[PDB]
Amino acid sequence: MKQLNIGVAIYKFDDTCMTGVRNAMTAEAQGKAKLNMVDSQNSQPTQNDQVDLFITKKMNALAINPVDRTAAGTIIDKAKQANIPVVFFNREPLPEDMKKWDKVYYVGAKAEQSGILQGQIMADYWKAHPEADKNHDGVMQYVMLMGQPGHQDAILRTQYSIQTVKDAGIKVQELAKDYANWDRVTAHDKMAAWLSSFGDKIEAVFANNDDMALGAIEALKSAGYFTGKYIPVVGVDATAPGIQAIKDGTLLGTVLNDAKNQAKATFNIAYELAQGITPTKDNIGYDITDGKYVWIPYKKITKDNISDAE
Ligand SMILES: *CC(=O)c1ccc2cc(N(C)C)ccc2c1
Ligand SMILES: OC[C@H]1O[C@@H](O)[C@H](O)[C@@H](O)[C@@H]1O
Ligand SMILES: [Ca+2]
Ligand SMILES: [Cl-]
Ligand SMILES: [Cl-]
Ligand SMILES: [K+]
């Protein structure tokens, strides 16, 4: 067969979710196309250099997980000039940037949905457990661990999780919120400081992803929770360690971020484009929305259906 080369840039390799995505992409590509996969080390200048090299090396298609998703416009400019099609994934280009060229696609998921499902987990717990309102004021005191500033999943999961709790008829009070950039250790450090400041005032913890929820859980353990003393913590992704924390009883719930189907859709699009074929639902195996987007559903995960994540 003809060798097809796809340039793949991952925003950083030390991201738990994106490790799942790139491993699944590598599995899908086996026997079909050569992935030239690089680590952008959470640096857009690094990724810009990598994209330039992909283009110089005449990749047949690009699959880019952009560090700064607002940089997708400049990446599209370069790709258009080189006539190399590009699919973006997981970090979403701005909608007007997507209209710059007709060989540009995006694969991801509707972050609003993951926020809603998060909020439902917490609201349902709150309604079933009167003891959760530790200061008996009829208000849920919570803290919020956000992802990276400006990332669409951080913006939308933060907004929709809490709006969903309010929509469920529950009054809320935000004690603290901060960016922990999807990182376990940073979330741990933020949560530890909050526990020193506010202590038993905290009644609920929301995190935009599992790694941050897990860091929060470690700070909570250190402060005496989850032995004997309980607090509900919710995340997003249903990674292997997230699933383990659900089983341990330390994570109340999460939302499956379907890396396997996002990887398949991304690969399939890049593979068709590498062959000079326009993606269709028939030839990539997924619905295409607004001519450019493939949205993969999120799914609620608690101890009640932990096998749905496995
Ligand atoms: C990218 C993402 O969110 C995600 C979700 C789940 C997930 C699970 C696993 N295993 C169960 C091994 C690996 C990666 C992964 C990533
Ligand atoms: O872009 C990276 C981020 O993507 C999000 O969709 C995932 O939930 C996070 O775990 C990940 O760090
Ligand atoms: Ca309260
Ligand atoms: Cl930690
Ligand atoms: Cl799917
Ligand atoms: K406990």
Which DSSP helix (H) or strand (E) runs through 170? none
Q: What own/partner pairs with CB < 8 Å and gap ≥ 24 does 54-60 have? A: 54/7, 54/9, 54/84, 55/79, 55/82, 55/84, 57/5, 57/7, 58/5, 58/84, 59/5, 59/6, 59/7, 59/84, 60/4, 60/5, 60/6, 60/33, 60/84, 60/273, 60/274, 60/275
51 lines ligand 1 (CB under 6 A): no
Three-state SS annotation for 89-153: ECCCCCHHHHCCCCCEEEEECCHHHHHHHHHHHHHHHHHHCHHHCCCCCCEEEEEEEECCCCCHH
308 and 226, same structural domain?
Answer: yes
Question: What letter represents residue 178's amino acid?
Answer: D
164 and 16, same structural domain?
Answer: no
15 lines ligand 2 (CB under 6 A): yes
CB atoms within 10 A of CB 24: 19
Q: How far is the CA of 116 from the centre of ligand 6 (A)?
A: 26
Contact 9, 64 (CB under 8 A): yes
Report the distance separating Cα 303 and Cα 191, nearest Å.
24
Q: Return left, alpha or beta for 254; rule: phi > 0 is left, psi -120 to 50 is alpha, else beta.
A: beta
171's CB contacts (< 8 A; 6+ apart) are 138, 139, 140
83 and 127, same structural domain?
Answer: no
Nearest to 152 by CA among 100, 103, 95, 74: 95
Q: Please provide residue 205's backbone torsions phi and psi, each rounded to the nearest 5 degrees.
A: -125, 120
27 lines ligand 1 (CB under 6 A): no
Nearest to 65 by CA among 80, 53, 82, 50: 50
Contact 48, 71 (CB under 8 A): yes
Instruction: Take atom 7 of ligand 1 and give the residue whose Cα is closest.
Output: 239
208 and 155, same structural domain?
Answer: yes
310's CB contacts (< 8 A; 6+ apart) are 243
How many helices (H) and strands (E) the chain has is answered by 11, 12
Q: How far is the CA of 231 from the centre of ligand 4 (A)?
A: 17
Q: Lay out the sheet containing 104-108: strands in order across.
A: 34-39, 5-10, 61-64, 86-89, 104-108, 293-295
- Alpha carbon 236 to chain centroid distance? 7
Residues flanking ion ligand 5, Cβ below 5 Å: 261, 296
Kindly give the number of the ligand 2 atom that is closest to the alpha carbon of 237: 8
Burial of 102: CB neighbours in 10 Å, binned 0-12, 13-18, 19+: exposed
Structure-determination technique:
X-ray
Which DSSP helix (H) or strand (E) runs through 177? strand 171-179
191 and 146, same structural domain?
Answer: yes
CA distance between the termini of the chain: 35
Q: How far is the CA of 205 from the centre of ligand 6 (A)?
A: 15
Q: Please provide residue 149's backbone torsions phi and psi, each rounded to the nearest 5 degrees.
A: -55, 130
Instruction: Take atom 12 of ligand 1 and give the residue whose Cα is closest.
Output: 240
243's CB contacts (< 8 A; 6+ apart) are 254, 301, 306, 309, 310
Q: Please provide residue 7's backbone torsions phi and psi, each rounded to the nearest 5 degrees.
A: -85, 120
Residues of the domain holding 98: 1-109+258-297
Helices (H), 184-280: 184-198, 210-222, 240-248, 259-274
Contact 145, 191 (CB under 8 A): yes
237 and 143, same structural domain?
Answer: yes
149 and 58, same structural domain?
Answer: no
226 and 101, same structural domain?
Answer: no
The count of C-alpha atoms lying within 13 angstroms of the C-alpha of 251, restricted to the half-sphere facing its C-beta, is 33
Q: How far is the CA of 63 from the centre of ligand 5 (A)?
A: 19
Resolution expressed in Å: 1.6
239 and 142, same structural domain?
Answer: yes
3-class DSSP assignment, residue 44: helix
Q: How far is the CA of 141 from the centre of ligand 3 (A)?
A: 5
210 and 275, same structural domain?
Answer: no
Question: What letter represents residue 63's amino acid?
Answer: A
Report the distance separating Cα 200 and Cα 103, nearest Å.
53
Q: How far is the CA of 57 from the centre of ligand 1 (A)?
A: 31
CA angle 56, 59, 62 (to 5 degrees): 110
92 and 240, same structural domain?
Answer: no
Pocket test for ligand 2, best of 257, 266, 295, 296 (most atoms within 8 A of CB): 257
Task: Starting from the CA of residue 200, give the closest ligand.
Answer: 3
Residues flanking ion ligand 6, Cβ below 5 Å: 226, 230
276 and 239, same structural domain?
Answer: no
Report the distance separating Cα 286 and Cα 281, nearest Å.
5
104 lines ligand 1 (CB under 6 A): no
DSSP sequence for 184-208: HHHHHHHHHHHHHHHGGG--EEEES
Report the distance separating Cα 210 and Cα 207, nearest Å.
7
Report the distance separating Cα 23 and Cα 30, nearest Å.
11
Cα Rg of the chain, angstroms: 21
Q: How far is the CA of 264 from the centre of ligand 1 (A)?
A: 14
Cα pseudo-dihedral 109, 114, 115, 120, rounded to 10: 160
C-alpha dihedral sign at 63, 66, 69, 75: negative
Structurally, the chain folds into a number of domains equal to 2
